Design a protein around this ligand. Structure first.
Ligand code: GCP
Lengths: 498, 85, 82, 205
RNA sequence: CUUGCUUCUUUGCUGACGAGUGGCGGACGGGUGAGUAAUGUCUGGGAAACUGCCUGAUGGAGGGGGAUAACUACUGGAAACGGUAGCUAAUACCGCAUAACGUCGCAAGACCAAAGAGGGGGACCUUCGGGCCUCUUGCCAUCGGAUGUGCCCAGAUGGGAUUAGCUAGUAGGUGGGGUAACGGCUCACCUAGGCGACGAUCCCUAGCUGGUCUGAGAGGAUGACCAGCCACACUGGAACUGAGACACGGUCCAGACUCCUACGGGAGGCAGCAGUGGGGAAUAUUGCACAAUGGGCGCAAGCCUGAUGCAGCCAUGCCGCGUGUAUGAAGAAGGCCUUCGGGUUGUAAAGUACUUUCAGCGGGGAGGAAGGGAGUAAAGUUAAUACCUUUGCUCAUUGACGUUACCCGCAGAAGAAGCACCGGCUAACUCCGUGCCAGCAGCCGCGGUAAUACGGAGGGUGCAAGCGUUAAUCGGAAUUACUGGG
């Protein structure tokens, strides 16, 4: 009964995936209230000054052009918080997120948001979920009526009846507690016919659903739902008890040899994203890590596996309530931030001597948009550095042709307004307004072995282009040139590097 | 500045009254003898010199006065009080 | 406070110490009064390994120079009866 | 650093035999010496003073295999010595280790001697030397280590040593390949043909 | 209850120690040349001086008192940060006895100081806190020595006359005050002096020197890295502690800038090491460790050190090596020229025989390391075979570099050659395409249809992991001539 594993058990993961226009930022800002601490272009991590346990968050942009980040950061997070709006319903967003989450069998707690607006019938929404996702659910509560009449929460497995007050978005207030279920004073304070309809719907829940499970909750077969609004400061207050009681210890993750448990050593903190950092005086690029296996040390010396080097790293930033706090060590199960300068890419593994790799990197193939043409052409060095600084990321990869002009911006998504807004910083001052220039399909990256690529360079030396990380694939113009490249036979051990 | 060795600041504050206050009372005794120089009473001048001599020798001993200032005070003040007498 | 100490001259990965009399507030390669003898730690057996003039060292002992540990070890190396 | 190219074209370019193609075979006459240095070698040049100085410098250098910065360092070392600069410069050129290995007969040509020095085979005073620019001190003994001794490449090339002048200032054992170095060579002993005066006039301006 | 295998409340009792008082260090080490044309630096002297820590000599170290932090209880503020009512200790503070070659005075005479701790123990006495015996360490007063610092004088240390008079505490004296100290250093009175054509006052520039480059020498530019001095720490000014700062990581005020806030109020100064922005043509890593030296404290063990010892990048500069060697004519193939005979590329390449420098991998392996710790034999000390200093001697040992330098073995000539020029200066030749268009060029200069001068090809020359261009200094320039011109 050592306290080490007992506080490993107090470390839980809930990242947050949802629809566009769903309410990620509001529910995170209000969970920050619960621990006494365009749209969506950031990723934020909140460790917490929470009382009982210490449950990490990790935000991500939810769109189709966005959420390229969450394919590799849902691998970091054991559990899953779904947020579905009633006006949006079950869309292709939820089908894509479930095609992500079914590959690892994550436990899923869902949370229906936007209770201030109009919401359809509850049985209709649960039937839409169970039909278009083919996965059942177990409802616990249902608030009052429709429209703006939602003014209560009626628990079944806790037998607690709470009421709601309006206009509590700024300050934390408490509403009095009614214990009884068949209380006629509750029928007088709420409304008799509406409460009878709610009791009839709870009888339909008890007669047309199942109960909760614990061994099937781990795979995620019966996913529980939770109701309430993000603005009224009421519905998310009940989430914390479920986050404590339902989420298990963080599971082991697969390596090439076997699964590494959370009681072992040899820190497996590999880097997930290289996110677009804000730059007051330094960059640090970011270092999100999986330090679930092994308790922190202040003077520990990490080992880069893919370059096999002993790197002394003593400074580690912790994300206390969003602000990058001081030099602090903690208990295993957290996510760090380190001080890197162009050395570590996505998915570079770390151990203390176990020279093996993971099975991650779910990144995809890009769609090459238009150009860099350097408006106000004085001081070109800010984009020759600062976008190549952003070229190591999974979303942005800057490509360099030989003719030293017309640099290609490589985005996997469609909306390149992210980089245009990111060109307005202390070391970013060029506008580069976009137009239409056609570059067809993603520059499929391949580099040959020795005594073979020399003639490949010498035959068509005007048809090469440097890449992010000093690569030379062929050139991306058409499918016919890719067929000629396949006809050219570059026989090599293939590295995707995407 | 944020420093573990800021103790020498406020301790010097703890000095800058007390030692200086001793210097204060020291020089007032010296000025008292100058009052006798403005008085013309040689007996009062000798009494004031005998009153100021042990405290100025003690302040010359305690590191505040560097034993040549106080010697200069005794020298020129003795010269004044026996030129008057 | 005057002292007799080494000065660490030479090249990179090639040390060559200078036993020298200097004030303790001076730098290692800084100002010195006068030099006396030398020491070479990589001077394995050849025609000369260590010179050390004991007359000026005794004169600085007669003045109050604090001898460091390496200089006292060199005094115990240059022994009066050996 | 090394030339590694047309070593016999240089002998046609200077006209005299630079002994770069000394070899097992005798005087070749296989390259049309003195009448074809290159494509338009039938032309007779004006051949001025700076011309003959530069040709004499490049002739002595491609005899001894020394690059220009290194030969300028040898001239700077010969300038501070006693006597006269012209004898001292040729003494410093003879004091190279690969030249001593060449004079011993341990290799047919000078590049072979430089390769034999470079490949950890030549050992002087019990200490192996890889740099061919080793300034040979007087009263030394040069030999070949037992792990690299007589793998036939020293052997037949030693027969060329039976056809050379075999100069006085060094002695070879020829039974165990143990040479012996002696006093510095006189100017009237080394090759009797090269002109130090043009080199001194070139490096004096 | 396996009554000893653990949990548990008290307990500074031991090893040690967050915070606090106090001692030392912070005035050294590190960084820059902004300001400065002499208040700076260098050379040579001088007296009217100071000096903790180092050390020599001579004495004392006797006897007392009062506060305060930390702490206790409450309270203002979110934090930063205190206030109120009480308590205590010291090598912290302050009195009392005495005091000498110390201070004052011609002398008589008067005055000036402290602090005790740690190890071990025989007799005596133990209110059994211990006095006592010894050793180590620390304090006070004086005289010295060295180191460092303060002060003064002479000479030397850029340009401008399109910079000609400047100065009024100014120059000198007397008296008072001030500094470790002469000194208008600072005040009261008296005279009109003081500097200046040997460049006074004013403007611009500049850290100075030992030195560096060039030059036969005399000279010219520079002084970035090594070292000494000076000045500075966002700017200006001022004081305190301290022997030493009129203070990089100390204080206050005036100004500008940044950040937090609950908005009542605070924090800050990378011309330190790294690192970031702007500028530029131009310059690096947000790395390891006290393994060695040195600095700080301690008796010692121990702690810190971005100085340093290194590690990573850059051909930025110097040095050395390799990218093969010997043989090899059918004088092969391809390119170029031609008189179309042939020549050149060319022993170059192909073939054969050997070799593996340096890199790759796999194994041995110094030196940078002196010390320090435990213990033994013990010479001193003492009453003591006890504590402590020192010397032999026994043992476990102290490396970031470091998979070190270096050596051996394995695979395969196998992984490793470019850049400028070819009319003269100045080293090296032709052909083709345009034709004062395109272009090259350091100067004279070519190209206006048969260019040794543009571009391309072949070939050669020179230098070599560097080669050309650009930028600065000197020589040539006796075109700043004192050497050495008119
Ligand atoms: N009244 C009300 N409005 C809500 C609630 N939750 C979300 N909204 C509204 O829906 C929108 C969602 O805002 P936002 O939090 O930025 O969405 P998001 O989930 O972060 C977007 P993304 O998923 O891409 O990260 C806003 O207009 C917000 O006001 C809720 O509980 N009540």
């Amino acid at each position: 009964l050592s306290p080490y594993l007992q506080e490993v058990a107090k470390r839980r993961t809930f990242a947050i995936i949802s629809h566009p226009d769903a309410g990620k930022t509001t529910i995170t800002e209000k969970v920050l209230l619960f621990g006494q601490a365009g749209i969506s272009i950031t990723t934020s991590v909140m460790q917490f000054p929470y009382h009982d346990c210490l449950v990490n968050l990790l935000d991500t942009p939810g769109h189709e052009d966005f959420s390229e980040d969450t394919y590799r950061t849902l691998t970091a997070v054991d559990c899953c918080l779904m947020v579905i709006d009633a006006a949006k319903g079950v869309e292709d967003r939820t089908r894509k997120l479930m095609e992500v989450t079914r590959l690892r069998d994550t436990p899923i707690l869902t949370f229906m948001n936007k209770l201030d607006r109009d919401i359809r019938d509850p049985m209709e929404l649960l039937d839409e979920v169970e039909n278009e996702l083919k996965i059942g659910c177990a409802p616990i509560t249902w608030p009052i009526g429709c429209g703006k009449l939602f003014k209560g929460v009626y628990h079944l497995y806790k037998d607690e009846t709470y009421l709601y007050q309006s206009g509590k978005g700024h300050t934390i207030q408490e509403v009095r507690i009614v214990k009884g279920l068949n209380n006629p004073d509750l029928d007088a304070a709420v409304g008799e016919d509406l409460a009878q309809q709610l009791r009839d719907e709870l009888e339909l829940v008890k007669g047309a659903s199942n109960e909760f499970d614990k061994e099937l909750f781990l795979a995620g077969e019966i996913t529980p739902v939770f109701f309430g609004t993000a603005l009224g400061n009421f519905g998310v207050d009940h989430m914390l008890d479920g986050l404590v009681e339902w989420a298990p210890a963080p599971m082991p993750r697969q390596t090439d040899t076997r699964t590494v448990e959370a009681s072992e050593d040899k820190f497996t903190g590999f880097v997930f994203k290289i996110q677009a950092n804000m730059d007051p005086k330094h960059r640090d690029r970011v270092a999100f890590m999986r330090v679930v296996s092994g308790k922190y040390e202040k003077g520990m010396k990490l080992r880069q596996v893919r370059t096999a080097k002993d790197v002394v790293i003593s400074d580690a930033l912790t994300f206390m309530a969003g602000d990058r706090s001081h030099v602090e060590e903690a208990y295993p199960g957290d996510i760090l931030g380190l001080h890197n300068h162009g050395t570590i890419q996505i998915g570079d593994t770390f151990t203390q001597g176990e020279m093996m790799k993971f099975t991650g990197i779910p990144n995809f193939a890009p769609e090459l948009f238009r150009r860099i043409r350097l408006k106000d052409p004085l001081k070109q060095k800010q984009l020759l550095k600062g976008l190549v600084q952003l070229s190591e990321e999974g979303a942005v990869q800057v490509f360099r042709p030989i003719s030293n002009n017309d640099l290609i911006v490589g985005a996997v998504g469609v909306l390149q307004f992210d980089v245009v807004v990111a060109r307005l910083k202390s070391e970013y001052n060029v506008e580069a307004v976009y137009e239409s220039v056609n570059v067809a399909t993603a520059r499929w990256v391949e580099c040959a072995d020795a005594k073979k690529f020399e003639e490949f360079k010498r035959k068509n030396e005007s048809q090469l282009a440097l890449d992010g990380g000093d690569n030379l694939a062929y050139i991306a113009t058409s499918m016919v040139n890719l067929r000629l490249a396949q006809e050219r036979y570059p026989d090599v051990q293939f590295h995707q590097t995407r | 500045n944020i420093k573990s060795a800021k103790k020498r600041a406020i301790q010097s504050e703890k000095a800058r009254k007390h030692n200086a206050s001793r210097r204060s009372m020291m020089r007032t005794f010296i000025k008292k003898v100058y009052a006798a120089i403005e008085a013309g009473d040689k007996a009062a001048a000798q009494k004031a010199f005998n009153e100021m001599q042990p405290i100025v020798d003690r302040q010359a001993a305690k590191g505040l006065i560097h034993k040549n200032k106080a010697a200069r005070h005794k020298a020129n003040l003795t010269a004044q009080i026996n030129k008057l007498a | 406070m005057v002292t007799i100490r080494l000065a660490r001259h030479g090249a990179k990965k090639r040390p060559f110490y200078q036993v020298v009399v200097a004030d303790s507030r001076n730098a290692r390669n800084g100002r010195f009064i006068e030099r006396v003898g030398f020491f070479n730690p990589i001077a394995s057996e050849k025609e000369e390994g260590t010179r050390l003039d004991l007359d000026r060292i005794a004169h600085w002992v007669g003045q109050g120079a604090t001898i460091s540990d390496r200089v006292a070890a060199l005094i115990k190396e240059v022994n009066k009866a050996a | 650093a090394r030339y590694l190219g047309p070593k016999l074209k240089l002998s046609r370019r200077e006209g005299t035999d630079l002994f770069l193609k000394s070899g097992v075979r005798a005087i070749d006459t296989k390259c049309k010496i003195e009448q074809a240095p290159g494509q338009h070698g039938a032309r007779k040049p004006r051949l001025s003073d700076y011309g003959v100085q530069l040709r004499e410098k490049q002739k002595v250098r491609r005899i001894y295999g020394v690059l220009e910065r290194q030969f300028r360092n040898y001239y700077k070392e010969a300038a501070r010595l006693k006597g006269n600069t012209g004898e001292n410069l040729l003494a410093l050129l003879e004091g190279r280790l690969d030249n001593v290995v060449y004079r011993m007969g341990f290799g047919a040509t000078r590049a072979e001697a430089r390769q034999l020095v470079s490949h950890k085979a030549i050992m002087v005073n019990g200490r192996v030397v890889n740099i061919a620019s080793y300034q040979v001190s007087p009263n030394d003994v040069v030999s070949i280590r037992e792990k690299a001794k007589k793998q036939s490449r020293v052997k037949a090339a030693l027969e060329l040593a039976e056809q050379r002048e075999k100069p006085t200032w060094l002695e070879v054992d020829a039974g165990k390949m143990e040479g012996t170095f002696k006093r510095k060579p006189e100017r009237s002993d080394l090759s009797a043909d090269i002109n130090e005066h043009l080199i001194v006039e070139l490096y004096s301006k």
